[PDB]
Design a protein around this ligand. Structure first.
Ligand SMILES: CCCCCCCCCCCCCCCCCC(=O)OC[C@H](CO[C@@H]1O[C@H](CO[C@H]2O[C@H](CO)[C@H](O)[C@H](O)[C@H]2O)[C@H](O)[C@H](O)[C@H]1O)OC(=O)CCCCCCCCCCCCCCCCC
Ligand code: CLA
Ligand code: CLA
Ligand code: CLA
Ligand code: CLA
Ligand SMILES: CC(C)=CCC/C(C)=C/CC/C(C)=C/CC/C(C)=C/CC/C(C)=C/CC/C(C)=C/CC/C(C)=C/CC/C(C)=C/CC/C(C)=C/CC1=CC(=O)C(C)=C(C)C1=O
Ligand SMILES: CCCCCCCCCCCCCCCC(=O)OC[C@H](COP(=O)(O)OC[C@@H](O)CO)OC(=O)CCCCCCCCCCCCCCC
Ligand SMILES: CC1=C(/C=C/C(C)=C/C=C/C(C)=C/C=C/C=C(C)/C=C/C=C(C)/C=C/C2=C(C)CCCC2(C)C)C(C)(C)CCC1
Ligand SMILES: CC1=C(/C=C/C(C)=C/C=C/C(C)=C/C=C/C=C(C)/C=C/C=C(C)/C=C/C2=C(C)CCCC2(C)C)C(C)(C)CCC1
Ligand SMILES: CC1=C(/C=C/C(C)=C/C=C/C(C)=C/C=C/C=C(C)/C=C/C=C(C)/C=C/C2=C(C)CCCC2(C)C)C(C)(C)CCC1
Ligand SMILES: CC1=C(/C=C/C(C)=C/C=C/C(C)=C/C=C/C=C(C)/C=C/C=C(C)/C=C/C2=C(C)CCCC2(C)C)C(C)(C)CCC1
Ligand SMILES: CC1=C(C)C(=O)C(CC[C@](C)(O)CCC[C@H](C)CCC[C@H](C)CCCC(C)C)=C(C)C1=O
Ligand SMILES: [Fe+2]
Lengths: 309, 150, 35, 37, 61, 32, 430, 78, 34, 31, 31, 44
């Protein structure tokens, strides 16, 4: 009880700290702290990186003429591919900067930190008597982040295909998908959009009804309003089922969209309705899918450099 | 706003459903409730402490929480509407003139913003051919923008 | 840089050992419930 | 394309793979036969 | 001798269909398992023997 | 087009083979 | 018949949870599920055999089960050419008959068999809280797994061998005579990095190592089963885990999720346990073949072309394919020297069959679509995507079931007491 | 004056007698509507062989507001 | 309970009749050789 | 000059976040 | 000194609301 | 040109199947709602 190990265990496991630590805490704290430190330093004063591996460096640091919107941390070089490139493997620190190691450092440490945050959620929930199913809800954003940052590069074969840590980087990321894989027509992205929009709708409407009902009745009063507003009597008359539905809709939507991105990593595709309507004599009549395909074709042609010096 | 609304919905549902009071012998907690209940079905204190020890800040007022839920998406969509109203007059945020001048000065300076501008050029050039038939546009293949020519 | 490699390996091993010996020191029985 | 001796039995085979997804459905029907008790 | 194998196989298909529709009914209905054990066992034996004879016929085709 | 008709007939018979047991048990007062 | 919600406390959508403490019903359910699995196996095998054209390659017509039989060396000759399609029919029919038998057994144990098995059949009876019977079951099933591995070894070593894709002049059916049983080689893979260039477990490249590893796994599994059937957990083991059915379920869920992820990756990357001439070429193989064939065509026409240096200092093809510079294959190693490709061999050491294989691999890249229109979906993409999704879902299942099992063991799985809240017995202002 | 429950009508005889002979009439009416060729005439949708007129080999264009009726009549070939 | 031609009757029939008509139309459209 | 302004704004945001986390008024209304 | 008007706008937008809120907080905290 | 290949026999066959499956499930979906509306009504 008084052993140094016992004292350390009690301190780590104590719930009287302002922020609970736990063992998942002891793992995640250094990881996330290193990630954020390196992220800030690279965002502020990082030198150019050759993302494409054709000796055409891309500047993304603030000191090199950039704003908040246009700045980012460029992913690793295409030459490294999917290899492991730690700091002590590069010939010199300058070469390490030129190739783009800090992206790998950030992504690895951040992924470990988020997983251990997931674990710590359950740990604290268990230390207090709560039920343990908040980690399941948190799995959706964690799954999406893991997909985008780790599974897509593995499928494509290089870390240069990951999402740059920025804003304009994210926009370029989205545009390159819409050029290459036709994400907009993939059913899983449709389910993700539906999940997000339905979550916003349900949040707004639940807030409205609950605030209206609360008078200086919480569910038996507003239910009369809802049953006659848009019909649909006796749908969610149990206060627990309603909140479970709220927790379930967006989580399932995000799970499906993450699985869709993971499947695209192995490159099946979105839907493809090109030239799906033809009259007699074999002539082709254009549909909206053809206009979308023209936009995608222009996008893809613009992206590819092909002639690289 | 939209992403925060989804986040609030999910987190509130998960917290309420994972802090229910023991008022039912059955394994399922759905049937341990009736609409005519007097007290709330979940412990605010436990959830408040949990989220004050995990995240750092937690709600302590039901009315404020549900009002925040209402407030977020409405403001987000209103701001989006104002943005599209501005766009209707071709008042678009497109330039970042300093970056454009610097890029035009020397070719050897590339940011993701310039790549986005080039992608927009490609989209316009390759889609206007059939998107706007009334313009009667015929771009020869020589002039169509392509990455091979940069 | 071999010294940096050694330092990183030592730190990672220390933290991982701490974690493993943490969850193995009778985790399930330290709960607010009584059973 | 199957041994010739079993050539006429081609169509029935085309239905075998889809049988499992019916079993789950059957369960629901069975529950519907007891008022979802 | 493809015709004999084909007709035996059709008979096996019909017998298997009947056995599938019958066995769960015999099991589920109360006081039926001990009442109709002989029928179920006879059906199973016929099914196995017919499988074996179909196999031998295939070996001879 | 005998193949299509035979496939449809076999599929229909297979589909009906399942609910028949449930109907028989319900009608005969089984333990379903 | 079935239970009711009031008696058990589980709704219909959770009805199966009522089987936790009923041994016979659980046994019947498991047997029926195994019968269903083997039913699907046999039915799909027959369906694929019915729609099989021997002239065309297997990967051009969406077949995923026949390649598994072929890689064992059934009715296939050099170069992956099909000789006869009888063994696939035999396998499917046998699986279907076994399905019938298993389904009958499962239905009998589910509907008529005794509800509880530990009253009249003590040998097969068990209670989840016991720590001896469960270990005995574990040992039995470990012995079965070891016997299966040894069956694979026996087939590979005495029953005609398996299809080795690394033999000279393309692959062929060969009998592995001297599997590598060296401990260093076998256990070197387990400690290799999972990053590029290393290939933690997916880097196995020869059948010798595969057979040796299977020998080792079989021996270890049988030895561990013997150990478990004659032992009980140590006190630290008894203080480390939670002893309940749902805890075991969660452990299995996590393990199976990890296995699913590993299967996804190994299907996507490995090409020795998944020979190219049946599952088609991998994406790296497709790009490498495109570069190789373009170089050969340019050299032949006369009008290197694209050949650059690897960052470590070797020789690779240039262009967008420089990322896939770790690929190795039967049709490219003879052209590879000590440091990457050799210019002399790449110039005048190409045999016609290598060029034909590269040309074939050019147009069958994994590019496809869910609508399945074309760049045609390779089997590797389907396997990888499906098993990745299944592994992710089973990891979520591990999370859920482990959390619930631990909460139930603690004693607050159904909610806070509402009379003695632990939080109210703590200092304020956390 | 109480909006009879749906169960009462579900078990009624006149309800079924009316509907089992009425609904099929609507279904056949729709089938004949789109089979006889009335839909193309009514809604102006061209037939597969009427898309490209003899003198026109490209998508039409209205390019006129106050004479759009005559423009559309000429372009459609009617 | 007795009277018919109520608001509910009109509301249900208005969305029921065109639905059947359009279902028939689409089912017929399915069998066109193009 | 722009970089200094951006860094100052980000630092200010982080400082407000930290102060809210650590120097909040106690939630005694319901606890 | 680039875009002096922009710098003045940013400074005013950061100062005036901040000062207003801080004065309000100090005024009310006296209660 | 644009005529329907299938005859009217299938038209009636499908009409019978898609007309007596929708006129008997439209009241079963609304029954809960109509049963709960009266409970909500005449109460408050
Ligand atoms: C510890 C944590 C590890 C996490 C994965 C990091 C490494 C990712 C990766 O690049 O791993 C790649 C490796 C395979 O490595 C490849 O191995 C290949 C082996 O092929 C070579 O050798 C072969 C031998 O036949 C062939 O000859 C082939 O042609 C030849 O190229 C090559 O070496 C490649 O360069 C190399 O990249 O995968 C593997 O070993 C197995 C990895 C399995 C896990 C990957 C998915 C993880 C998903 C986590 C998120 C899930 C959702 C969470 C929700 C909450
Ligand atoms: C997971 C599978 C499983 C399990 C655990 C059981 C267990 C049981 N069954 Mg069930 N059964 C099964 C599958 C299973 N069965 C299947 C698939 C069928 C369909 C054929 C049946 C059909 C069936 C009937 C009809 C009956 C049972 C009965 C029984 C009970 C008594 C068994 C007995 O008499 O000992 C037999 C012991 C033996 C050793 C003989 C087994 C013969 C096998 C083929 C030889 C191999 C076994 C050997 C030990 C393994 C060697 C491994 C080696 C290679 C390393 C027992 C609870 C009886 C009962 O009491 O009802 C509940 C009964 O009447 N079972
Ligand atoms: C493969 C999945 C699977 C399996 C193996 C089982 C197995 C079982 N369930 Mg579970 N269940 C499942 C899915 C599954 N269930 C799902 C998805 C749901 C939700 C819809 C449920 C909901 C549920 C409830 C609510 C209950 C069960 C119960 C049971 C047990 C009694 C069997 C039964 O239905 O009562 C008997 C049913 C019948 C007699 C009617 C079905 C007639 C036959 C068996 C149909 C199949 C015949 C087959 C085609 C013939 C094969 C041919 C062969 C004989 C040669 C049994 C152990 C009960 C139990 O034991 O709980 C304590 C129970 O109360 N289940
Ligand atoms: C189906 C397989 C299986 C399962 C489920 C079990 C389950 C169990 N065994 Mg058995 N065992 C098996 C196979 C199996 N065993 C085989 C094949 C052998 C022969 C080699 C043994 C030999 C054996 C012995 C000798 C003992 C057990 C014990 C145990 C218990 C404790 C769990 C444990 O080993 O520590 C789980 C693991 C740890 C405690 C330490 C893990 C920490 C490391 C750092 C994690 C990383 C692993 C690895 C290094 C990472 C690299 C691999 C990665 C790439 C995947 C548990 C009941 C013990 C027991 O309770 O007494 C019977 C015991 O003394 N087993
Ligand atoms: C072999 C593995 C295994 C086993 C034996 C069990 C067994 C059990 N689980 Mg667990 N579970 C598993 C895997 C497993 N589960 C996995 C992988 C997940 C992650 C999704 C879960 C998530 C889960 C939850 C969240 C819950 C259970 C519950 C239960 C219990 C009731 C079964 C049930 O849900 O009713 C029968 C199930 C149904 C009627 C649902 C069928 C409809 C499904 C959802 C869709 C059909 C499949 C669909 C086509 C595929 C879509 C995905 C596709 C892209 C691949 C039972 C003890 C419940 C319980 O009470 O636990 C004590 C419960 O609340 N499980
Ligand atoms: C060098 C460096 C630092 C790099 C940084 C680079 C860089 C990119 C900087 C960031 C720039 C930046 C700030 C960009 C964002 C700018 C931006 C777009 C601003 C939008 C602002 C705006 C006015 C939008 C309008 C819509 C709007 C108001 C959105 C609000 C979003 C918002 C705050 C959402 C809520 C988020 C959130 C996490 C809520 C959780 C709430 C919570 C803890 C509840 C938990 C909880 C649940 C219960 O159920 C109960 C019961 C209790 C009790 C309880 O507690
Ligand atoms: C290990 C984990 C570490 C996590 C660290 C991060 C924690 C973030 C803390 C957010 C504090 C926000 C201010 C709350 C100020 C405050 O005191 O709020 C207090 C408030 C609770 O107030 P009460 O319920 O007591 O108020 C009742 C009312 O009636 C008024 O009395 O908290 C909330 O409502 C939820 C807040 C979520 C809002 C999240 C905003 C996130 C913004 C992130 C911005 C990042 C910018 C980055 C720039 C580079
Ligand atoms: C058609 C064909 C043929 C033949 C066939 C045959 C002859 C078949 C048979 C089949 C069979 C004949 C099958 C069987 C099966 C069986 C099974 C599948 C069983 C199982 C069992 C089990 C599993 C058990 C278990 C147990 C016990 C009992 C006790 C102890 C414990 C345990 C659990 C172990 C020929 C060649 C001519 C041609 C080709 C194909
Ligand atoms: C192959 C074959 C066989 C066998 C077979 C079998 C055994 C089968 C089974 C089958 C089955 C077993 C099936 C089942 C099916 C089922 C179904 C198909 C169902 C459906 C359902 C539904 C559709 C529902 C719906 C719903 C509900 C849920 C209720 C309410 C309303 C609703 C609408 C929502 C043999 C070898 C002998 C011989 C030869 C042939
Ligand atoms: C309990 C129950 C359940 C389930 C169950 C199960 C899942 C069962 C299974 C069962 C099974 C899984 C059975 C099986 C059977 C089988 C059989 C019976 C077979 C037969 C075969 C045959 C007959 C063949 C024939 C042939 C061949 C060999 C090929 C070609 C030619 C021909 C077609 C002739 C549920 C959950 C739903 C619900 C509740 C009730
Ligand atoms: C076939 C193969 C091979 C080999 C293989 C082998 C040799 C394997 C082994 C394997 C193994 C040998 C495995 C193992 C595993 C293990 C594991 C996976 C473990 C885990 C554990 C855990 C997870 C734990 C946990 C925990 C916690 C954290 C809580 C507290 C306590 C404890 C510690 C319990 C070769 C290359 C030749 C060929 C090819 C492939
Ligand atoms: C007791 C009683 C009830 C309850 C009743 O509904 C009726 C029928 C009135 C009416 C035909 O619905 C009149 C509908 C005409 C309506 C005023 C037209 C304008 C409003 C809407 C367009 C009606 C349709 C709304 C529906 C779609 C929800 C009579 C005659 C009764 O005696
Ligand atoms: Fe709420």
């Amino acid at each position: 009880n008084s052993s140094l190990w016992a004292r350390f265990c009690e301190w780590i496991t104590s719930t009287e700290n302002r922020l609970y630590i736990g063992w998942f805490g002891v793992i995640m704290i250094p990881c996330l702290l290193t990630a954020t430190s390196v992220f800030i330093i690279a965002f502020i004063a990082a030198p150019p990186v050759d993302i494409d591996g054709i000796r055409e460096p891309v500047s993304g640091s603030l000191l090199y003429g950039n704003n908040i919107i246009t700045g980012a941390v460029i992913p690793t070089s295409n030459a490294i591919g999917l290899h492991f490139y730690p700091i002590w493997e590069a010939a010199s620190l300058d070469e390490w900067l030129y190739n783009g190691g800090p992206y790998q450092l950030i992504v690895c440490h951040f992924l470990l930190g988020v997983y251990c945050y997931m674990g710590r959620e359950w740990e604290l929930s268990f230390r207090l008597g709560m039920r343990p199913w908040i980690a399941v809800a948190y799995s959706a954003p964690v799954a999406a982040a893991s997909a985008v940052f780790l599974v897509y590069p593995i499928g494509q074969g290089s870390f240069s295909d990951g999402m740059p840590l920025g804003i304009s980087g994210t926009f370029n990321f989205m545009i390159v998908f819409q050029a290459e894989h036709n994400i907009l027509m993939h059913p899983f992205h449709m389910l993700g959009v539906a999940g997000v929009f339905g979550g916003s709708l349900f949040s707004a409407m639940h807030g409205s009804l609950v605030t209206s009902s609360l008078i200086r009745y919480n569910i038996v009063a507003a239910h009369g309003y809802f049953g006659r507003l848009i019909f649909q009597y006796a749908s969610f008359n149990n206060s627990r089922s309603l909140h479970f539905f709220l927790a379930a809709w967006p989580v399932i939507g995000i799970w499906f969209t993450a699985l869709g991105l993971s499947t695209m990593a192995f490159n099946l595709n979105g839907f493809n309705f090109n030239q799906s309507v033809v009259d007699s004599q074999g002539r082709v009549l254009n549909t909206w899918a053809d206009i979308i395909n023209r936009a995608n074709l222009g996008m893809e042609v613009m992206h590819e450099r092909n002639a690289h010096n | 706003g939209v992403l925060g609304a989804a986040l609030l919905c999910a987190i509130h549902g998960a917290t309420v459903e994972n802090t229910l009071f023991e008022d039912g012998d059955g394994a399922n907690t759905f049937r341990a409730f009736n609409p005519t209940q007097a007290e709330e079905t979940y412990s605010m204190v436990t959830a408040n402490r949990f989220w004050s020890q995990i995240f750092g800040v937690a709600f302590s007022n039901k009315r404020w929480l549900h009002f925040f839920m209402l407030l977020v998406p409405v403001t987000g969509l209103w701001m989006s509407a104002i943005g599209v109203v501005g766009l209707a007059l071709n008042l678009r945020a497109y330039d970042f003139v300093s970056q454009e001048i610097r890029a035009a000065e020397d070719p050897e300076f590339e940011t993701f913003y310039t790549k986005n501008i080039l992608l927009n050029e490609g989209i316009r050039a390759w889609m206007a051919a059939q998107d706007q038939p009334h313009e009667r546009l015929v771009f020869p293949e020589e002039v169509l923008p392509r990455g091979n020519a940069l | 840089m071999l010294t940096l490699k050694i330092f990183v390996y030592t730190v990672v091993t220390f933290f991982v050992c701490l974690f493993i010996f943490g969850f193995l020191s009778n985790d399930p029985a330290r709960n607010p419930g009584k059973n | 394309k199957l041994p010739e001796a079993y050539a006429p039995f081609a169509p029935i085979v085309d239905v075998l793979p889809v049988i499992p997804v019916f079993f789950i459905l059957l369960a629901f029907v069975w529950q519907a036969a007891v008022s979802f008790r | 001798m493809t015709s004999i194998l084909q007709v035996a196989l059709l008979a096996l298909i019909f017998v298997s269909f009947a056995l599938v529709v019958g066995v769960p009914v015999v099991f589920a209905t109360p006081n039926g398992w001990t009442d109709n054990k002989g029928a179920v066992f006879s059906g199973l034996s016929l099914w196995l023997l017919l499988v074996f004879v179909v196999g031998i016929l295939n070996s001879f085709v | 087009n005998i193949e299509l008709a035979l496939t449809l007939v076999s599929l229909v018979l297979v589909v009906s083979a399942g609910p028949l047991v449930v109907v028989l048990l319900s009608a005969r007062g089984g333990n379903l | 018949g079935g239970r009711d919600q009031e008696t058990t406390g589980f709704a219909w959508w959770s009805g199966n949870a009522r089987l936790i403490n009923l041994s016979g019903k659980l046994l019947g359910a498991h047997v029926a599920h195994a019968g269903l699995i083997v039913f699907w196996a046999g039915a799909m095998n027959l369906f694929e055999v019915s729609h099989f054209v021997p002239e065309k390659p297997m990967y051009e017509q969406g077949l995923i089960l026949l390649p598994h039989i072929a890689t064992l060396g059934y009715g296939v000759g050099p170069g992956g050419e099909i000789i006869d399609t009888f063994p696939y029919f035999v396998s499917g029919v046998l699986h279907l008959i076994s399905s019938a038998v298993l389904g009958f057994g499962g239905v009998y144990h589910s509907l008529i068999g005794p509800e509880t098995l530990e009253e009249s059949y003590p040998f097969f009876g068990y209670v989840w809280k016991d720590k001896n019977k469960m270990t005995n079951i574990l040992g039995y099933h470990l012995i079965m797994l070891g016997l299966g591995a040894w069956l694979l070894v026996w087939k590979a070593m005495y029953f005609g061998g398996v299809y080795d894709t690394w033999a000279p002049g393309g692959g062929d059916v060969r009998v592995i005579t001297n599997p590598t049983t060296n401990a260093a080689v076998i256990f070197g893979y387990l400690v290799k990095s999972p990053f590029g260039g290393d290939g933690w477990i997916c880097s196995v490249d020869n059948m010798e190592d595969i057979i040796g590893g299977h020998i080792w796994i079989g021996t270890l599994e049988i030895l561990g089963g013997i150990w478990h059937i004659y032992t009980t957990p140590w006190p630290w083991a008894r203080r480390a885990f939670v002893w309940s059915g749902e805890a075991y379920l969660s452990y299995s869920l996590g393990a199976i999720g990890v296995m699913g992820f590993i299967a996804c990756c190994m299907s996507w990357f490995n090409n020795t346990a998944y020979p190219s001439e049946f599952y088609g070429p991998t994406g790296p193989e497709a790009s490498q073949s495109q570069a190789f064939t373009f170089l050969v065509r340019d050299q032949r026409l006369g009008a290197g072309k694209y050949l650059m240096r690897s960052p470590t200092g070797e020789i690779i093809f240039g262009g967008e394919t420089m990322r896939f510079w770790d690929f190795r294959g039967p049709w490219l190693e003879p052209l590879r020297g000590p440091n990457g490709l050799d210019l002399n061999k790449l110039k005048n050491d190409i045999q016609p069959w290598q060029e034909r294989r590269a040309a074939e691999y050019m147009t069958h890249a994994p590019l496809g679509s869910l609508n399945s229109v074309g760049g045609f979906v390779s089997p590797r993409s389907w396997l990888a995507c499906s098993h990745f999704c299944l592994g992710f879902f089973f990891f979520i299942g591990h999370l859920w079931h482990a959390g619930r099992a631990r909460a139930a063991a603690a004693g607050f799985e159904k909610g806070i007491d509402r009379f003695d809240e632990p939080v109210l017995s703590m200092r304020p202002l956390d | 004056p109480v909006e009879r429950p749906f169960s009462d009508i579900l078990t009624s005889i006149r309800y079924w007698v009316i509907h089992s002979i009425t609904v099929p009439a609507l279904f056949i009416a729709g089938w004949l509507f789109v089979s006889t060729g009335l839909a193309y005439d009514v809604f102006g949708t061209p037939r597969p062989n009427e898309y490209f007129t003899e003198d026109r080999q490209e998508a039409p264009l209205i390019t006129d507001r106050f004479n759009a009726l005559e423009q559309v009549k000429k372009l459609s070939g009617n | 309970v007795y009277p018919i031609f109520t608001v509910r009757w009109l509301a249900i029939h208005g969305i029921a009749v065109p639905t059947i008509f359009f279902l028939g139309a689409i089912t017929a459209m399915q069998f066109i050789q193009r | 000059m722009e970089a200094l302004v951006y860094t100052f704004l980000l630092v200010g945001t982080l400082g407000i976040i930290f102060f809210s986390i650590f120097f909040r008024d106690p939630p005694r209304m319901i606890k | 000194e680039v875009n002096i008007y922009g710098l003045t706008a940013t400074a005013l937008f950061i100062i005036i609301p901040t000062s207003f809120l801080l004065i309000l907080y100090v005024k009310t905290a006296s209660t | 040109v644009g005529d329907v290949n299938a005859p009217i026999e299938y038209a009636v066959g499908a009409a019978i199947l898609v007309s007596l499956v929708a006129t008997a499930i439209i009241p079963i979906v609304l029954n809960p709602g109509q049963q709960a509306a009266d409970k909500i009504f005449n109460a408050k």
